[model samples]
Target chain A: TGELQYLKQVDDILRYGVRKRDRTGIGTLSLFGMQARYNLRNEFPLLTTKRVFWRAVVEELLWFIRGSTDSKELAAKDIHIWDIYGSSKFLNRNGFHKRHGDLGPIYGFQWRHFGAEYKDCQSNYLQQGIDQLQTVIDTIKTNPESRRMIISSWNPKDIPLMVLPPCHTLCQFYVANGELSCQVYQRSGDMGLGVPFNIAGYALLTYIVAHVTGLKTGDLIHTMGDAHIYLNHIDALKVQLARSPKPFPCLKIIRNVTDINDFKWDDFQLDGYNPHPPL
Target chain B: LTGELQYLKQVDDILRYGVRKRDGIGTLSLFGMQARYNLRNEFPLLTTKRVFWRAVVEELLWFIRGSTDSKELAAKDIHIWDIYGSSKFLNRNGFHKRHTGDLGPIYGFQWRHFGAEYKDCQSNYLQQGIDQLQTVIDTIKTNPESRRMIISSWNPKDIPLMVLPPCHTLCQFYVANGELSCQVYQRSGDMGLGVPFNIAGYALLTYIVAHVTGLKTGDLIHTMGDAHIYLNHIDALKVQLARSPKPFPCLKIIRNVTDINDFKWDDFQLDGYNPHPPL
Candidate 1:
């Protein structure tokens, strides 16, 4: 049902989306301020129209949770996801006076150490900044009904300094009937290339937080600013639209992890996921 | 038909699924609800109850003009900010010895001078932190297709130094088909009073921004983390829900204003508004 809702938005975009040119000069058939809800009550929202990079989603999320700024650290483990942005050519074009691997106050840093004073990515200011993730968990356990259960990565002071401004800028968690839910407000979402990976990533985060909080995972509401399909991915989306969606995969945690930081690769297992090959 | 139905459905959904809140004026709340109000032809003011017309208009101006003091709003007899601007409200939030009227670095300050160092209300912060509202208008005029146009009110550094932290959260603007759309991610919404006001407030905001930017008003997409109705207000909400909605009124901008900051109260004229009389 959740997968069907996602498919509807994608189809809606393909049918009636407006064409807009970007700074990249590659245009997009775009719709702004779109939203979809995926139920995490029974399954994780790993999109079933096409195979999403499940392992990459988990590892990237784990990397973000650990508050690591080193892109080379990901490459050390054979994950080159950050390589494009961390490359010398890209950084030089952006006029960032630095070597590779520094992604200045991105997701992880904002999650764990929000508003921390930064000299560079290399400097460890472990004691500085508010630990928003920890604060969310603590407040959830203590005051579950608090309306202020928010985590923001959109730091205005740091945006000009960042290698990339955050796309999934702000997310807030809500608890109802002992079930934890999360909504991520992504400022810009690449519907084809990025959204599939993004869906699983936030759903996994909800599961991780729910596991430690002694609660059941509820729903993941993915809301976007610019939900756009690139001109390059039109044929790919057409292929995706033709295929019927399969049931969303349910997540299984291997252990009863108390600390959010302690969860690892072996802990997560997806059940009942069979999808079409990637476009 | 163009706008208010989405809001009506939202109220109903919250009523059916909302859970008990832990605080006073106990709320039955739902998480991650989104409703889109089309500002293409009509304004989104609810006809079930006559909304505070002046408050919505004046508060937005207060935000755009960048005033952190409650006194200016208070002078206009809009007592909404009166309670929060009190000496007692300040002391209760651990803001001891602070004077009345100063709201610290809340929405208005964050809107105009995001990331600016917060001093008292009387301080001049010229050439300081990014003028986000001004910048958004500039970007809308030049690079309308840019995905980076966002005005954020969530400042992690300034949260602890305020009267109340942001509940309305971040908003991002998008342009397509010669029209502008605004998406607002409010962390929490008080369904009875606050959410109704928010819907119209942002719709008016989008209209004003679109008017200044030389674009037609697209949609005011309101996405919420926690959309809640108070236990006390449920009866009124039920009554409000029972009544059929009339056609939403249309807003006509009388002035041909180029600058966003250059607008008077008389500039807007609301036409074709008929209601069930305040429920």
Candidate 2:
């Protein structure tokens, strides 16, 4: 619903000959991207009106770094969001072949394992994340002239280990006017479920990294690879389309925790927001 | 390998224990899955030879299902497009959320939308595929009376739009005295990198369908279309071959999440088993 309203204003600009009906599922709506640069000092970046499953968003992001396919770990933390694929019953019922755990070679596997050739490469994914956060902050703080302050999780070597590779793969930091900005490059995104979660997750990540690095959260930019409206989710999309897009507020992590893995769900707060009800 | 014949078990292992390795673009191995029956019992329909057509059919169906995530693919570990999408995104110049992370709709988009033309309509070919799978399994179990129970995903409309036209395409079901079995036909597969996952995935699907319909998990017969070892992954496959087989485990599925649409990543499980270090 948020997406439909968001696109309707410039629907004609973004989709030239595309009809409203054509936009939902019949056309090649190949790419979609959105960027919001809000001054976090005044608000938390969150889609206020709809009940954004922030917990699922955060846990899934963490799960990606952990490279886990099993939902048990995420479930234990009360994040039932994307627990379908990671659970054992689903794995077994669907016939996943593992000798030990329910998890498959999902995000964490690729981020940490990379592949056999890179097995010897560092698998300390959390550490890599922590380091990248610091590096981005440092660049924003120290080297304002440098433009290549980016971190990536996608590895060609890890392709074989996963059933599918990561879609939201790489991200970079931008600094302008003494404000820190983050731009993410996603190869593929599910416009309905993925985009909203992505907005919240990255915003939080940016906020946390900024706090640790001692910079302000300037903006969160999302650049998608293939932003598609799935055929099955058309009804949901229509529900969003019927509603009006309101200004979504930001979510602020209240805790002062420095470690990326240390923060819990309560650490963040979704500030000032209202939107048409969710589909 | 723990000689039990559940394909689900193998897929889970690949995710959790398969040597976290990566190479050129990807890697692969042969993960064996067996469904044994007593000598006096009918042979499990699970195939031991290469049958190409069926694999491609199933794969095409997978894409149509709008299953960008591996939750559904985990049902059939043999499908690799989802992981490919994730890996490609990661390997892109930027993160998955960046502009370059687009790898196309790999599978789900094509199946559900076809020329992206089925928006706001109740036509989901993917759900149809799942329903058909369920139908076949049910027929096989209930009326051991009639013998024709097969599910096909050979939608010709998907060919031009598919990233890689279905490799593991069509799959079928056969019943004998209430026992349900499946046979999959694949078109093109990277023997080294793709076969292992493929075998496990389809086999798992068979197991689940059988369980839901009250039939025992039977044989998973696989027929390859063009199974080849990509020149790049030879050494890695060899490494896998050099390694010994480990015990195969059992998978547990929860009936609580009956509707595929409503399922999250948590509604699955795998319990007990040990695996040797991945090659």
Candidate 3:
């Protein structure tokens, strides 16, 4: 019901929002300043209206946690989310992708080696920029009530070197009453294709952080700047909105992963995820 | 009503039901909320209590000029920053007289020369990092529809070198139907002391950008990460919120400034800003 309500509100934006053109050459019905809160204790926020690629979400999140920027690494795990951006067409158009599968300093790079001098995907990253992930995890355990447990991926110096600027720019973790909550601020969100994944991904991230910190998972708050529904995806979204939502899914992390970096794809298991076909 | 009502609701939440957290000055805080204003209708200067409009304009213009020294602001008789740059605080914090008026790489420095190496307040800032203000202005004029009109001041590499890490982390501009809108993401907001200035400052920024770029002023979206009221400011907030809001003010830009960097203090005026006394 939570994820369904969120999807419906985003769908409503297509009717009420202003029409705007975007970089992808796909016009969008866009609205600015939207927020949704998902309680991780009640349900994992994977949309039951459309079949989500849970594996892709899990693997990609783990890849970022592992502090990797290479598109080839994701490809090795059978996640092709970065393939379009890493393709020869996109690479040639941008002319910044020097290597075959290099994504430059993107999410993972900024996550671990923030502001590190980028040489290549295989460059040494230790002790370059501050390790935000490690510091956040440590702070969550030691000083849970601290207001500065933030992980930011927006590095102005490395923006030019990146294949794409981070959409989910920064996230902050909060701890209170033996519970860990998170808030992620995304600059741009494609409501049709991207928002669902972001909700599930960040919910999983909160769960992992809470698990490792020995706290119960609380809320996952998503704040968006430019929230848009692509023109081409409107009809499919309408179809999705008409269908009733099923019961929410439950995610189980089977392993006792002490460090967030130790999480693997096999560590997660999804239950009761039956949903309608992909839009 | 849209802006003021949303803000009042947030204030009520903090007063009645915010989580207790010991932070900078200690706060009862809530995390992840957003509010928007339509500048096309009226200026969003708070009417429940008085706001300092001149300080907002001067500080914004200073940021556009990329001036970091507090003496530059003090020269114009704006003493808002004097407390942060006072000799007692600086000396106690291991800073010397040479860095007396130098509030190290804060907002303006990051806006104009983000991620540039910081030496001193007098260091040359030409051709350093990206000029985000210039870039956003140019992008609004050239490619108004682009979603990448983002000016981010959250330079992870420069946080340690700053006097204060930027609370206003980043902003993005959106233009639709010949109207330019701006959205700012603030990492933390001091609801009683800082929120009014932030709203007026960014709304003025939106007006300036729209004036220069030949677009009408649209909405100003403010998204907050940790929105809080300091423990000491509670009584004042209760009194302030009890007062009913008056009619909003109207802002007037007296000159046609072609460049965003060309505006001065004399080019602006505020009309119909009759409100209650300052809290």
Candidate 4:
């Protein structure tokens, strides 16, 4: 019921949510400060209620690990999720844009080189901002008991330089009793469209991190600030809520990958994923 | 019968079911939790225990003014930060005394001049990193519907320069129906010592901001990552939890102060604050 529990939260929000205007020009049913915990040991938390585009989730995570901020890179991997934000229509409206398909310093850039000055998408950011991803991995290996294993994508200095602010603002990794648990603090979440994908993506990231660090995956805790369902998506969400959930799929890492940067799309395999059609 | 019922349940859960870890004085900790308060109904001061209201008020005002000097706080009879700045503690912890009572760019510095270069305790940071507090105030006045009204205190570049990394990392303000609501993402919380102070401090901040912005006070939502109780504080927490909570107090801002930086401690008045003695 891991995935069903999340769908139930969406249903609850729709029933008792406050109507609010959002940036997307679509109104929303919103709530503040909600949390969902996914135990990785039971099963991967990809929504069995609907068919998640698992490919997009995996490729996008890999793109972040590679430290690339260009939408073209994601496009090359057949992931166009960021293309909307990278579109000239969106960028021109904001009175900004980098090169074509460039997203300036979005999630990947901040993950690899947070607080680094933005020159361009291709600028070397190794020694500029602190490397949070690498640091987290190193901490997991050496100082597993440390309470400071955190990766933050919310860089105040670089917010103006990006196309969109980070939704997943910060995450902290906790290791205890040889189990690695991750808590992600997402500032904003779109319940229907984004939450399912986000849950799968982070759970995969947790599994990968745990695998490489030689620890058991414990819990994937998703804590959100402004969790909302777009008004346009609410009717569709009602249809989704009425449907029962199927069993969760198991995510398998096909190879023994030692480094985080070495993961590829083909390195993952999903088994027993029977889900309803995408809403 | 308030939002703190969920909070007390979390404390009980942690003490009974959380993992024991060697963090600080040792802790029984859980991850990813949230608490909510409706400021319009009642203020969210903890009535089960005697909270130091004066210290919370003075400390929050100090943060708004962007002052990093501990002496300024000590001058107001607020010595909560004295231990962190004490010469005995600093020397023993491999930290040198840079100034008489500097706290090394903590909350106030991050709020006012995040990512700015640190140049001793008294250097002017007016032109340095983004002033999040001012920006949020201006946004609330000009564009109340904006979801970007955020004040982030987690600066990766300045974290090494800080005496302690921010526990309350970032907060976003939401305005709806002429009511201002706030959500804070705190990366860590000490349920016994820090959570009450944090709740009251941020609630007062929301009230003050609402007053200046010509809006009604709405909700203060607190989202926490690694929420824990010190093992030594278990008995005290249990005793306090056994007592039924009293009615919440009321907070009143005495003057109409348009400027956020122009407020003082005397401007606030707390009423109907009959409570149990300190635990």
Candidate 5:
């Protein structure tokens, strides 16, 4: 199955990973520097062994694509993934931006206006910084061979300003033989929880961008720095490891959304998405 | 045979199955790949080819001190940056506004004084933003289990102002069982020339940080987004591929240095580094 590699990683962590205390004050079984390749040719790379939060994946990506740093947008739609750091308490403690819901230069801000001076979330930053995502898409169309087609979120200038520093640092797109492939370089990943989400998210991103460029999907390579299983998630991962891995669901792009930014929730459809159950 | 085999196998695989692209007058390219070199047993300077150990050391040390001037390394006759650092190159490439030898906010600049406003290579930038290298070093000493020990060079804010965008975008350090391991994510790697240097160079970096922190070296995991072989380097790569690998060299640290910045190049020695002559 396409997800066996993920299972092997989880098992490897349980057996050979080092026990280390991490930032969350939770203990971790960690292994540094690993990669899992999920082939997206003719099918999607969504995990079938454990049911993924598919709606969250769609909505969050949509938010990022819109380049909105306000958590209010996600919260309005009940997508609470961005709710943690967007709280008023975090804002008061965090010095860079004191605005109520501003996540100061996070994924969306860095994606759209990387070098721009960030004002409040409502302030228009339409003509600031490098438009990395747009440049990436344009590069894919004009010169598919360019390796410089990269969208990076690890802005050193913005780290202190950001409510949460990015885990997935950057993603570089590759095009060859009319196929688009993407690789995400995540600095630290919670193997049991966040890693799987990143895997599905980046794969769908590739599918979306590929759709826009009229290219076939290739592979989504999830490269990690400190890949770890949280102490709390150990029992959950063990059960996940015990279950037999099943086929990956195929993603069907419903609309010919020629514009990458124009993709909506209804544009994506998952087929044959069989799974055991969520942790 | 332990770790260099992965490097060799990837080069061979790329040569065999890579797609045709523009960079290569006749280049073969692959999207994403990884090679692992365990530092637990010995050093991983590839035995198949003689990696330039001197430049690797000098360049890293130069990067450590956060000097943006190319002439700083040029003083030591390390002309690796000479072509790119020359005034002619800068003047012709729309960077005419900057002074000579000013490489702008390159890897070293981003590594040490990230987000520090860059004026020129000559400007003093002390007490600027986050000192990522020192910060990571502090975390490794205080909290070895930390997963956020990252030194990133892909400063989106500085990318536009850079002489050359960083190829080795970011690196993360992991500690477990009194050992330090490093994983580097390179957005683009020249497999024939740059990858070997990166493999050995980053491994050496791991050793240096481990040395200062009183931890043993663990592993160096080199991950790549686009690993490509230049057309001109194919003959060299193919010839090197046929050679057998030897036991990796042992790096000896002469001084028991407490401070990372205080360590000198003369304090280290490479022993038993019997690799094939450079192509």
Candidate 6:
């Protein structure tokens, strides 16, 4: 119940804190950070903005998780976030001797392709994922005494090909007393919008997996890499400052998605959402 | 089959490329990189110079797939990397006048637990990890259409809690004609010893994961975020440069455990490992 209000409050608090601390940049750009978590249940993770594009948000996340870099795929569904990168402003296509050369289909492309088809290499990232899950379950059931459960997201070579590096990079999981818990380490975030979305996105991932694996959702813990507020978003953030937060709902993913690539927005349902109005 | 020795060579190459010749001191003190191995051969970890080699190997594995305290590192006499953590901890324990009560356990705590709550508040990072690995493997086997698969391990927020934030932050998986490959990007690394261990650790991880997911190991690309060599390590690294790298044995993971958290030190095996004395 207090989550929404707290979310609202954190803005002013973080804003003033950064300012008082004499940090870099002015207003919101000064607050560069990532919002992370290991849980998805307390509140249906959704933005309180006046116009929340739930479909676009889910689609974008799905696109990233799928590692798709083509703007046509994303833009086909009205996700314009990648358009900036597609334009010359973000990437040079004219052979202008740009610093990074021609960065074609950077983020989604790397996430999905990872140089496997084009480059001669071997990597079992997806299959190992299943094996890793099995290990976690076994540890929970057999060897809970150990502490080596983790998953990494950042790839070094991909940096050259990426327009921007991953913001929410790595995550780890733990099992204690019959419960499964997780935490995400995010490198960058937009507090007003991005953080809440990430919180909900990963939580959904946890919930679906835990349900399939027969473990209860413990808590979603967020460990940020660079949790910051964009200087541009400050005004909108301040506008929401005075409003008291209303209870934000929790979303229940109806489909049990064991396969990372098998999720659709229709698979989930949001229930009981109330808010003070979007920023 | 000694990935470590090869990595040392690469590290030497980086130093050759980035170091200052006259000073003999590395212009840069950090280098985070990764490499791959062919399971039939390729031992991980440098045999060149004692290099506190065991500690380096253990720490990388510990951090790679597990979350633990610096106490574990300290217990093994690997405290050189703990200066920043201790400073922050002291501040948290009220050693600093500026810090509010309990400045909050940063990365260590958050990675393990965020805000000390374990309900829906906890994250499911572990599951995401499993999923990530699985994504790579599946792409290798079934979906040749998939791009290179990758995973990241660095989170910006966890930086404050860590004795130091992850130098090697992310990893990527690639598949070509059914073969698997991997790469890693380290934000900062201790060139003298850490780089060698990093090479072996990820290579071993790549091989094992590939073996499980059913792919031939191809190449392990190592990338650095801020590759540097410390002034203190110059002589030692140079000493290592003089001696030809001895053929180190390949490291085998005895257990086929898939859970990132369940394996023990005993699960690893090193055969045919011999190298030059540590600098």
Give native contacts recovered, as a fraction, per prediction: 0.84, 0.00, 0.62, 0.52, 0.76, 0.03
lDDT of 6 by residue, A81-118 (tens): 66666555556653323433233424334444432322
Worst 10 residues of 4 chain A by lDDT: A93-102
What C-alpha root-mean-square deviation, in Å, does candidate 2 show against the real structure? 22.5
Every model's Cα RMSD, please? 1.7, 22.5, 1.9, 2.0, 2.0, 22.2
Query: Which of the two candidates, 1 or 6, achieves a greater lDDT against the reference?
Result: 1
When 2 and 5 are scored with DockQ, the better candidate is: 5
User: In model 1, where do residues sit more than 4 Å from their true spots?
Assistant: none
Which lDDT values do the candidates have, in the order given?
Answer: 0.82, 0.46, 0.81, 0.81, 0.82, 0.51
| DockQ of model 2 vs. true complex | 0.01
* Ordering by lDDT: 1, 5, 3, 4, 6, 2
Best by DockQ: 1
Q: How would you encode candidate 2's per-residue C-alpha lDDT over A247-274 as one tens digit per residue?
A: 6575566788756556666776776666
Using DockQ as the yardstick, the better of models 3 and 6 is 3
lDDT of 3 by residue, B169-246 (tens): 778888778889988887778777688779988999999988887889989988877788888888888988898778
Candidate 6 wrong stretches, greater than 4 Å: A1-16, A19-39, A47-52, A87-90, A93-147, B1-279
Determine the backbone clash count of candidate 5. Answer: 0
User: CA shift at A191, candidate 6, in angstroms?
Assistant: 1.3
Docking class of 6: incorrect
Question: Distance from true position, residue A185, model 2, in Å?
Answer: 1.3
- What class would a CAPRI assessor give candidate 2's docking? incorrect
List pairs with backbone clashes in candidate 3.
Answer: none
**Reference-based TM-score of each model:** 0.96, 0.42, 0.95, 0.95, 0.95, 0.44
What does candidate 3 score in Cα RMSD to the true structure?
A: 1.9
Score chain A of model 1 by TM-score against the reference chain A. Answer: 0.95
**TM-score of the second chain in candidate 3:** 0.94
Q: For residue B237, what is the lDDT in candidate 6?
A: 71
**TM-score-sorted candidate list, best first:** 1, 3, 4, 5, 6, 2
